[PDB]
UniProtKB/Swiss-Prot annotation, chains A, B:
The keyword Nucleotidyltransferase does not apply. It comes from Homo sapiens (Human). This is 3',5'-cyclic-AMP phosphodiesterase 4D. The lineage of its organism: Eukaryota, Metazoa, Chordata, Craniata, Vertebrata. The chain holds residues 388 to 711 of 809 of the full protein. Mn(2+) binds at D117. AMP binds at H76, D117, D234, N237, Q285, F288. Mg(2+) binds at D117. Long isoforms that share a conserved PKA phosphorylation site in the N-terminus are activated by PKA through phosphorylation. Isoform 3 and isoform 7 are activated by phosphorylation (in vitro), but not isoform 6. Sumoylation of long isoforms by PIAS4 augments their activation by PKA phosphorylation and represses their inhibition by ERK phosphorylation.
Amino acid sequence: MTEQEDVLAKELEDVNKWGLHVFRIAELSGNRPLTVIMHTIFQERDLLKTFKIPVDTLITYLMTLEDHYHADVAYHNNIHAADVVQSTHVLLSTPALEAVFTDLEILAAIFASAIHDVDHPGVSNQFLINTNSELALMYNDSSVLENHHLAVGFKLLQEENCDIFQNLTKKQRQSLRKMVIDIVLATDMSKHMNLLADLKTMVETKKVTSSGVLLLDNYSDRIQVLQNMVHCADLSNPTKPLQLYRQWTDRIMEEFFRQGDRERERGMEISPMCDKHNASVEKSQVGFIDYIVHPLWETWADLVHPDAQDILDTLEDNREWYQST
Amino acid sequence: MTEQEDVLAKELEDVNKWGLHVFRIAELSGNRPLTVIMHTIFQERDLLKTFKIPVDTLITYLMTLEDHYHADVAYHNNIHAADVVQSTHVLLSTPALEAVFTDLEILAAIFASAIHDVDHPGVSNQFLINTNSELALMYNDSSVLENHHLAVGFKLLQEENCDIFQNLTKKQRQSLRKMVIDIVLATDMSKHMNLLADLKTMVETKKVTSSGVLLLDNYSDRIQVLQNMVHCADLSNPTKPLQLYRQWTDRIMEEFFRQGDRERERGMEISPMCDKHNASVEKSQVGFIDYIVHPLWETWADLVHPDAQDILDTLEDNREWYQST
Ligand SMILES: COc1ccc(Cc2nccc3cc(OC)c(OC)cc23)cc1OC
Ligand SMILES: COc1ccc(Cc2nccc3cc(OC)c(OC)cc23)cc1OC
Ligand SMILES: [Mg+2]
Ligand SMILES: [Mg+2]
Ligand SMILES: [Zn+2]
Ligand SMILES: [Zn+2]
């Protein structure tokens, strides 16, 4: 009813490609991008049958997960969530990683992406520490939000008909949890430097087949790749078509400025990039690429050579655009 | 009223010596050893005046802290708490560490010792993980209890007239919290191997004055010593006079067997040393000394040479006693 009419279905076909219009999907789905993109990817990778997950349990979980993301939060919301999911899903399919990961590992990274920012208040760990918040007390000033994201994402499974893992062996369920925790905790931005250093080391001693597919025998190497993958997905805004990048930039500044406002009314030191009266959005983005995003993606490109070549070029293009204006 | 009459005051004079009868103090204080030993040490080190802490706030906090330890728990209770406090307090006074630590650092280690096991349910992290408990969900299967001890110990400050840190500069309060967190998290037994390795390295590159006092210029080295100190205090039962050691052994077995019971009724793999039908208390203690306690204390003795010589001899004596019976 008909084919050109349900535009949602039509847009959901670009799910396998880097540059999917996630905002369009957000709008057409009724501010429910995370649910529809998850279910598409789950069907696309057959995961419902592979792990005997009923569809009406999957739906019920995703609905509640999506609810527990905050709609009124500019950047760290359900859209960004769906963005990172979809981005992970694409990176899971680059040539150099074919058949490398098991269904369970794949499942872990997607689920990890799905929950990785849930219940985000729209302020940084440091703000939660400095304001002596409930959560920073709860988690002793270390990976405060990342810990809370995992707690929320996992607890929601206990909700009325929400256990998407119900029909898994304890061995699987325990392995999955181990992996999901390891990934989400790596999304903490204060770990970025170690992750990158670790990823650089892995590039030097990488093992590839005649085809050019990566050899990762041990869990230790595999989980590290997944950690970096979702971290890259988390920092992928500047690698998307400029049209999307600029909207992601608008949302991150609106959220940053909201924090800096609260920091101002409390008489605290205003956090970098949070002062709207000392703003330089464009120069900030150039810096963000030059010291965070580009060094990361260049190292990711080395690992999957040369699958991330288009991604890397787009980045250096967008870098030049923000340098120009 | 009189001097030989208040036996509590008389026993509280042995506070500065290794081998204080903590059980006697527990009984004479009305099952309130932690409060009375803390207040003695605080007065002994003048800390109330040095940090402008009012006495009736100190009392009110210690009362509530002591309450939040579980009396019905055989080993991980308020007595063990007071034991570890008192043991830390003694180790803080060995020749080789004179004037090494600041009042704030000293305060941190004692407070750390005081709270390090609060609200302990009497089961291990692993049990809390394997039973999918609230806390393991809350803290994502890593340092579960240690995290919870810190949370509880710190939250109780917010209670009606309990803020013992009220009259501290933000700079101090923030430094203290940083230190207290670092210490308590090191009490996690799964970290033992790293702590020991780290301590061994520190022994090799140790710097001492002509007097024979340790030189620790940076925070990095200082906090590491405090971490090991409280960890040693936590594993000091076998270094005490046999009279006390054997009671600590009775309490740890009663608690272990209570867990193994619960594990049995749930149909789980019974944890090492928790099966009362496959028990070998004496042989277990010999092993505990040979692979955990002695390797740790030998390394601690090297660091403070030769201050821990009596401690080390007593250990090897008690080792021989459990080997004999
Ligand atoms: C490790 O370095 C950082 C990493 C992340 C941030 C904050 C942040 N988090 C997630 C997505 C972001 C996305 C951004 O641009 C779209 C951005 O602009 C600088 C900051 C972002 C700040 C950082 O400090 C410069
Ligand atoms: C790192 O190794 C361990 C450390 C601690 C434990 C459990 C434990 N915790 C605190 C105090 C203890 C005190 C004990 O003896 C009094 C004891 O007996 C083996 C076990 C104890 C078990 C361990 O496994 C063998
Ligand atoms: Mg995050
Ligand atoms: Mg403990
Ligand atoms: Zn994110
Ligand atoms: Zn303890």
